Amino acid sequence: LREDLKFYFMSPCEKYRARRQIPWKLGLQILKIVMVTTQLVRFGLSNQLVVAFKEDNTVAFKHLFLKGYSGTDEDDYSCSVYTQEDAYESIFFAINQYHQLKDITLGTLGYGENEDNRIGLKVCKQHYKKGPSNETLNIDNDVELDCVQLDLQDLSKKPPDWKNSSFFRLEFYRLLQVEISFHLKGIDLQTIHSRELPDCYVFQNTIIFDNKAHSGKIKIYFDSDAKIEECKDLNIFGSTQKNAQYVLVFDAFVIVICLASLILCTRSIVLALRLRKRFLNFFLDQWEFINGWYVLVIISDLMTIIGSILKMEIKAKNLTNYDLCSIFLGTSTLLVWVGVIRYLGYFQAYNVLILTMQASLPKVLRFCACAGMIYLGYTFCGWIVLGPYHDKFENLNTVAECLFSLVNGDDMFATFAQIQQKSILVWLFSRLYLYSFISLFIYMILSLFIALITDSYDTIKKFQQNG
Amino acid sequence: LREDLKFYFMSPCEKYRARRQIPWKLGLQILKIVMVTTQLVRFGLSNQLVVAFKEDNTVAFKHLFLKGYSGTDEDDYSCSVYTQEDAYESIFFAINQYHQLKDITLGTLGYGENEDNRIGLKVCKQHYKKGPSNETLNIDNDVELDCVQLDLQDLSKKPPDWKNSSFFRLEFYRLLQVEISFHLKGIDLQTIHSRELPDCYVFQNTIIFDNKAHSGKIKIYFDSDAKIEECKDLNIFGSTQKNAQYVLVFDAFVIVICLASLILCTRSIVLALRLRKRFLNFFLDQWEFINGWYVLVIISDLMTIIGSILKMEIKAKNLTNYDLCSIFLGTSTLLVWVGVIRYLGYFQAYNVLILTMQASLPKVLRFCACAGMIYLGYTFCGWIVLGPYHDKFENLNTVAECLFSLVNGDDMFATFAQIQQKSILVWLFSRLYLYSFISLFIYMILSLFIALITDSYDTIKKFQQNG
Amino acid sequence: LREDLKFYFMSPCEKYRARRQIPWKLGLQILKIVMVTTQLVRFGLSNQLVVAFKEDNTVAFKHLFLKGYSGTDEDDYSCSVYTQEDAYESIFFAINQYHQLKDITLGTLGYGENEDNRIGLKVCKQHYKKGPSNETLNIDNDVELDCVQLDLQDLSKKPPDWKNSSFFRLEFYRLLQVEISFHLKGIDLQTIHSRELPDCYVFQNTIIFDNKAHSGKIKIYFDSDAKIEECKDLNIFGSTQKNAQYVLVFDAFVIVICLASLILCTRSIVLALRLRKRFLNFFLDQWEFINGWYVLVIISDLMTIIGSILKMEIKAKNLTNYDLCSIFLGTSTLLVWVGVIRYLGYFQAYNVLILTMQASLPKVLRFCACAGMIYLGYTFCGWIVLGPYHDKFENLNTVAECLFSLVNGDDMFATFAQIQQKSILVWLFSRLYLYSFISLFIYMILSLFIALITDSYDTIKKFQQNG
Amino acid sequence: LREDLKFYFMSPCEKYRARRQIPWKLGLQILKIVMVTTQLVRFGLSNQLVVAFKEDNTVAFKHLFLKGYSGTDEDDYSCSVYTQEDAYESIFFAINQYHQLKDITLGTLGYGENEDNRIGLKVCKQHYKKGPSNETLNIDNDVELDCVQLDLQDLSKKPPDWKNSSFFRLEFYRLLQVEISFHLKGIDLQTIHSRELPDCYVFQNTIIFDNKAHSGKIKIYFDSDAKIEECKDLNIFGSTQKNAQYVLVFDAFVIVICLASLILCTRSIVLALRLRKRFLNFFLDQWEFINGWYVLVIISDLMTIIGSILKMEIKAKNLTNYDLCSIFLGTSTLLVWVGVIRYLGYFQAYNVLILTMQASLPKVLRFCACAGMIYLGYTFCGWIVLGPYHDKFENLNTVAECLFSLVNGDDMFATFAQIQQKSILVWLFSRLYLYSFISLFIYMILSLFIALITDSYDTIKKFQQNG
Ligand SMILES: COc1ccccc1N1CCN([C@@H]2CCCC[C@H]2NS(=O)(=O)c2ccccc2)CC1
Ligand SMILES: COc1ccccc1N1CCN([C@@H]2CCCC[C@H]2NS(=O)(=O)c2ccccc2)CC1
Ligand SMILES: COc1ccccc1N1CCN([C@@H]2CCCC[C@H]2NS(=O)(=O)c2ccccc2)CC1
Ligand SMILES: COc1ccccc1N1CCN([C@@H]2CCCC[C@H]2NS(=O)(=O)c2ccccc2)CC1
Secondary structure, three states: OHHHHHHHHOOHHHHHHHOOOOOHHHHHHHHHHHHHHHHHHHHHHHHHHHHHHHHHHHHHHHHHHOOOOOOOOEOOEOEEEOOHHHHHHHHHHHHHHHHOHHHHOOOOEEEOOOOOOOOEEEEEEEEEOOOOOOOOOOOOOOEEEEEEEEEHHHHHOOOOHHHHOHHHOOOOOOEEEEEEEEEEEEEOHHHHHHOEOOOEEEEEEEEEEEOOOOOOOEEEEEEEEEEOOOOOOOOOOOEOOOOHHHHHHHHHHHHHHHHHHHHHHHHHHHHHHHHHHHHHHHOOOOOOOOOHHHHHHHHHHHHHHHHHHHHHHHHHOOOOOOHHHHHHHHHHHHHHHHOOHHHHOOOHHHHHHHHHHHHHHHHHHHHHHHHHHHHHHHHHHHHHHHHHHOHHHOOHHHHHHHHHHHHOOOOHHHHHHOOOOOOHHHHHHHHHHHHHHHHHHHHHHHHHHHHHHHHHHHHHHHHHHHO | OHHHHHHHHOOHHHHHHHOOOOOHHHHHHHHHHHHHHHHHHHHHHHHHHHHHHHHHHHHHHHHHHOOOOOOOOEOOEOEEEOOHHHHHHHHHHHHHHHHOHHHHOOOOEEEOOOOOOOOEEEEEEEEEOOOOOOOOOOOOOOEEEEEEEEEHHHHHOOOOHHHHOHHHOOOOOOEEEEEEEEEEEEEOHHHHHHOEOOOEEEEEEEEEEEOOOOOOOEEEEEEEEEEOOOOOOOOOOOEOOOOHHHHHHHHHHHHHHHHHHHHHHHHHHHHHHHHHHHHHHHOOOOOOOOOHHHHHHHHHHHHHHHHHHHHHHHHHOOOOOOHHHHHHHHHHHHHHHHOOHHHHOOOHHHHHHHHHHHHHHHHHHHHHHHHHHHHHHHHHHHHHHHHHHOHHHOOHHHHHHHHHHHHOOOOHHHHHHOOOOOOHHHHHHHHHHHHHHHHHHHHHHHHHHHHHHHHHHHHHHHHHHHO | OHHHHHHHHOOHHHHHHHOOOOOHHHHHHHHHHHHHHHHHHHHHHHHHHHHHHHHHHHHHHHHHHOOOOOOOOEOOEOEEEOOHHHHHHHHHHHHHHHHOHHHHOOOOEEEOOOOOOOOEEEEEEEEEOOOOOOOOOOOOOOEEEEEEEEEHHHHHOOOOHHHHOHHHOOOOOOEEEEEEEEEEEEEOHHHHHHOEOOOEEEEEEEEEEEOOOOOOOEEEEEEEEEEOOOOOOOOOOOEOOOOHHHHHHHHHHHHHHHHHHHHHHHHHHHHHHHHHHHHHHHOOOOOOOOOHHHHHHHHHHHHHHHHHHHHHHHHHOOOOOOHHHHHHHHHHHHHHHHOOHHHHOOOHHHHHHHHHHHHHHHHHHHHHHHHHHHHHHHHHHHHHHHHHHOHHHOOHHHHHHHHHHHHOOOOHHHHHHOOOOOOHHHHHHHHHHHHHHHHHHHHHHHHHHHHHHHHHHHHHHHHHHHO | OHHHHHHHHOOHHHHHHHOOOOOHHHHHHHHHHHHHHHHHHHHHHHHHHHHHHHHHHHHHHHHHHOOOOOOOOEOOEOEEEOOHHHHHHHHHHHHHHHHOHHHHOOOOEEEOOOOOOOOEEEEEEEEEOOOOOOOOOOOOOOEEEEEEEEEHHHHHOOOOHHHHOHHHOOOOOOEEEEEEEEEEEEEOHHHHHHOEOOOEEEEEEEEEEEOOOOOOOEEEEEEEEEEOOOOOOOOOOOEOOOOHHHHHHHHHHHHHHHHHHHHHHHHHHHHHHHHHHHHHHHOOOOOOOOOHHHHHHHHHHHHHHHHHHHHHHHHHOOOOOOHHHHHHHHHHHHHHHHOOHHHHOOOHHHHHHHHHHHHHHHHHHHHHHHHHHHHHHHHHHHHHHHHHHOHHHOOHHHHHHHHHHHHOOOOHHHHHHOOOOOOHHHHHHHHHHHHHHHHHHHHHHHHHHHHHHHHHHHHHHHHHHHO
């Protein structure tokens, strides 16, 4: 039935005068765009404050408890020691700084009760089970774990006997690690200006003096786990914070709107399929009656719904970890803004470029299929050869990202210079390898990617012009 | 009337022999180019000296008054302290260095009178209004502000009692900030070689010990506000500086020339419109009789006039802030040099490229319209996800600039490496995100931008060749 | 004979139904891909541990024995001294740190016997043969070498007389170098968790205090040579490591499979040549009956075989140097993964891109022939001129890599800024040189490389479409 | 006369069989290439050693005489001081280190006689002519210069009175600079292994304590001027160095060969012009009978001749400055290697690319003419606006190089991030400016440069194919 199929394939701008139907579903989609974007913005702006407070407190803790800390971490660990005396100095510094906390800290910070309800410091050792050294070792396979609890009144003793205790004989040739752990209370007092009750915090802090490698270096890790707990005893005049109602009602509105959009899009797909079957049955156009933009909308609505549920759960349980909810909401927003291109396609000057991209994607991917085998071979060869001599080739994922950046011309000279001429064979191989890869990929593969795009544009343009 | 319309559409090189009219307006435009460029050059060369003197004095002040200053700022603040004793040491160092200024400074520098006409040092505290700590805080919402004035004869007292005063109990758990402020006189003695009277300066200096965050770190800000004031009592033999007459007369000349150019361009536009109406009335060419280069000239003349007025005002009032005047004059100069292309268009070999750019701009912008939605979605998603884990994604504008640089291949490997694998989910998402964005934008969008430019060139060239 | 030639030129997917022959050789090639890749992965993963242990021990040694070592090397040497007293302090620090090793080290480390079977420290001097200074030098051409052996019981003497010995008069104006050498035993105790017997190590350590240049700086080199030796006396309960059988049997399997693949590929080439001669003799197609992918397979199989033999030799002799074997195996793997493209060529959509690359390569190389002469001239000129004033132009290979990176837009602004304006002539020449090179190569040569690729794509595509 | 003109226009490969003439001039050109390249290589390799020795001695001097020198210069000066006491400490450190030189230096170094034939240290002061401070200055325009000579026996006095002398009252508010100057003898003893007599050196060293700016910072400059002088009294057994004969005879050979090549090329040009006039007179081809490669050869020969003369002069007068000779020889070598393309043009597959480049250059330059005006406007605007707030825009040449690097995508994100948001107006303007410039130049101008190159290639290829 032509009188209906043409109306279906039309645009909303024309339907308003072919049948004078108002485009309320387009208004629903615009409202969804606005509400999703504003929800994401509010969520990010609220997360920034909590993340900043936790990270700043962690930096202050590193400066307070780590001896000689320079303010920047050494890779995944804060600092390291190489001498038998440096380790003792760092451990005793951490303990002594814990003892004097009230006199040194600039924050609104204090001691917290541990799991045993004691206020104090726990330090643990892990040594091999038996222990002459280096020549006739008796070291057994399994480990012995020893811990001691030091309370504030123990550290206070005029002569801190604990420092002379038998516990601190570290026999570093058997040592696996030493762990220092304690709890601290905190308050995010900066929030007081809102007249809301300020958020308290509890920090679970651990210092790990790690020499699993037994290579003569101890790596020092500082970790802090922060929980909100409860502002249970404070006399700060003002008001409490029950804005959850407001935030929970906006999330409910977002969920409802996304649900409505999903229902309407699925209904549109069902109607299009009924039209397709009617066309198939009517008489002996293309099979693709399904509008592909509807699928993207359905995916985005599902992700937005589940991310909003996750956000409501996190707020209700007063959690402070946002990774999965952030991923869901951000991907939903990304797909929501991509879907705006559907409304630009209703105009001729914009449609040809969209059709050019649609024609471009498959052949570019089929050429990526060929390029990927050369890429894999080069990744394996660079990892196996240059890895022991180059920081950018240490492991396979770093190799892949280095090569991907190198195809785009990034950091090329540093990549060339970063490998020493200590081994002449490896240096010559590195020169051959880098020259071949960079030349082939930049000057041939990327040039064929430009040629394919240009040919797709020419094809689409000549189709649109000639008809 | 063809005998006039053709003459109007012609070029000045041909009018000199079709009607032997001399091209005095082109000479006026060339003179305007020369005078605007030389005014901008003189202005910048004069600004460099004042800016350099102020900034060098600020660096010397930071070295003089900030304890342990390394010579480079920590982001927007000069330095920071994390310990209760470091803050006291920094504050007392600032005060003591102020006391000893005459014995430490290498410059031609001295004490200045404050608003109260006293010579001395003012330091202020800002604490919460009530103050047990951390467990039962009585902290009220509003702040109490306390200040003390320390004169030179007070700091001189053999035993500097001020250091033992009750004022310096900082109760850091209530502390918002401590501010130290003072005035210094200075002389730009380097100018003496000109036999002009040297420019004196007054520096208003403030040191802010800031812990609004209450995160256990105090940020230390140093700020200096410099005013010229007057060289009211000096015996340096030589001559005074009244070159203002010279500078004010050149600015008047520039204003007059730009006014004449604006009047002539508006007259040309009026005459072109009269020609257009005469053509419309004559008989049953294109509607665009208005030369678009005239609009750019009018805009540039308006900006030059207002910027010259601003410059004259700044010099007359002896100010030292140049932002708005610099913007106006620089944009005027930029548009003036762009307008030289109009004179290259009078030659065939150059005209085709100008026409190619004119044909290129609209379709490139209409493709930018489609690309911008993908760009916005990626910006929001990267901000929400990678922001807590990546310095380049902390806030939305940084995200946008990072993505824009990334499309152009800049700093790609560092962008890949800058995000820790502490959270595996976020790391995998970052890899997917970066690969998708870089691949799509570099290998498809930029390739369609090259294809559009090439097609525009082919169209213009075949039009010019075939006729 | 057409009935056979067509079958020969066919694809394996079609032969399974034209003659129902199973493609067992393709299965052999897939098995070879899998086994080669897994062998390379296991080899790299095993090498990482040994390399990491050796390098970490070297870093710990540098921190232990080098005075004031900052944790990062100064180019090819660890550190340097410029003062007559700094050198003495560094030498005596190295000796004293050797004396106290058991009390300072964090690792499972101990003293090793030297070649003379003594446990101790050897230090050697190299001075000119004769020695007034600077005005009337009597310095002869040849050198005098003097060494002393210091045992542990000598260093222990309450008053370390050795420090006052006549040996340590270094007369630095005649000094070539001072060398300190010693042996250390070590254990890779981290491996104990496998219940395998841990790998012991012997480190041969040398410290070179080098002033061959006589330019007033002594360069300090630290080198460590590690050998496995034998875990001959240890009481660590567990099991020994005879997994060699497993690793040796997988290498034997890889060798056998590569040998079979090589034999089959050579047989296929022989059969193709017989077909070619039969075609030549039959009647008065192209001469290239040889499938070029077979040659790559043969090369890869030869490299894999020899690399596996090298790996087996290294493991049997318990060596720890992997450069040549890594090169052979990695290049073999790279060529193996490149050869997968042969299987993509059996599909039309992929074949056209392969043919485009094949058509592109020769003309791109013939244009590289012209570009290389300009490249060589610029390399020589930049080396001769900018070398004394620019770190990126010091020597010819650095010049070539800098120019290659510069063509790809890398580090351009730093390259411009890195040359001082101390000599105005050289600065102007550097500006002219850099602008000319960058402009010519980026905006003309790379543009002709894009044009050649596009023309090759157009030719291949129109051939495939039109037939 | 066709029988001669065709032979003239031919190639040497064909002349060997059309007339069997041997191509001895091509052999002369090949010999010239070889000899010029080897002369340049020997020259650079010999210069490297002298430059390295001088620079290493300068670094050792900076470490010896500059207090607290970190091993890296602060821009154009080695180090700086901001305090009245730091300057005194640095000056007295320099003098005391000079006094103790024999006990601290690691090199073959000693004291040199000054112009007055004394061995000692000269230090000079420059103050304003009159000198209350800051309030009523009596400072006159002109300067007073005061110097004192300190000999070794003066510095030796048990109590170094000189340190208490009235000379060292620096009245820093009048101070322009303090200069310390001395001479040192040196020997390049590393050359002794050649059995040649070693090269002695004399270093003229000056330390400038500079505060011309009077901004509260003193900049400390160290400069060293090295001359060879004569190895007039040394007992080092071996042989002298008279290899000059060898080097002077190779330079004479190069001069002779370049002269012969120049004469032959000019003769060829004269013969071509006679052919052109004969063609013009014969009958009523193109006017360009002159082979353009001959002009390049003549220029290269002239530059090689004059550079060889300069090199011979420098060696004869025993100078150590090579800038102008290096420029001449390097440019000669660059043009010599570019001229090899003439021999590639004798082959069809290479000729089309050369013709493509020749056709490309003019239209690319005519588009550069249009692009340069936009470039100039942006340079002026960025200098005037962003200069006070951005290190990359401080002065016009830095602006131009920054923009040129920015067009090529280098350092884009750092350029965006390097400007503070202290002034919001300037920050917004910087964003607008950077986005507009980068977008316009990368996505439009560079795309038209690619289109012009492709169109030139298509034109040349279709001309060569169709005929
Ligand atoms: C969105 O995706 C694309 C859109 C358009 C064009 C290409 C792509 N791709 C890009 C690369 N990308 C892979 C990402 C993971 C690393 C390996 C890449 N594969 S690669 O062919 O070897 C390759 C490598 C460097 C440059 C170009 C191609 C695949 C997607
Ligand atoms: C002068 O302007 C242009 C002249 C010619 C071509 C393009 C542009 N444009 C460039 C980008 N520019 C926007 C600037 C602000 C950030 C977002 C940009 N938009 S974008 O399409 O997403 C995009 C992003 C990366 C690369 C290419 C396009 C718009 C102008
Ligand atoms: C695999 O190889 C290539 C595949 C496809 C296209 C080009 C190449 N080549 C690239 C360069 N490469 C040489 C490597 C050693 C330095 C000199 C290079 N030669 S260059 O022409 O002067 C040149 C220089 C810069 C940019 C482009 C061309 C040769 C191979
Ligand atoms: C050898 O030269 C060229 C060979 C082929 C193509 C272009 C050039 N040119 C490049 C630029 N170059 C000028 C160098 C000095 C700075 C200004 C440049 N001019 S620019 O048009 O504004 C411009 C700016 C950026 C990118 C492209 C063009 C001129 C030569």
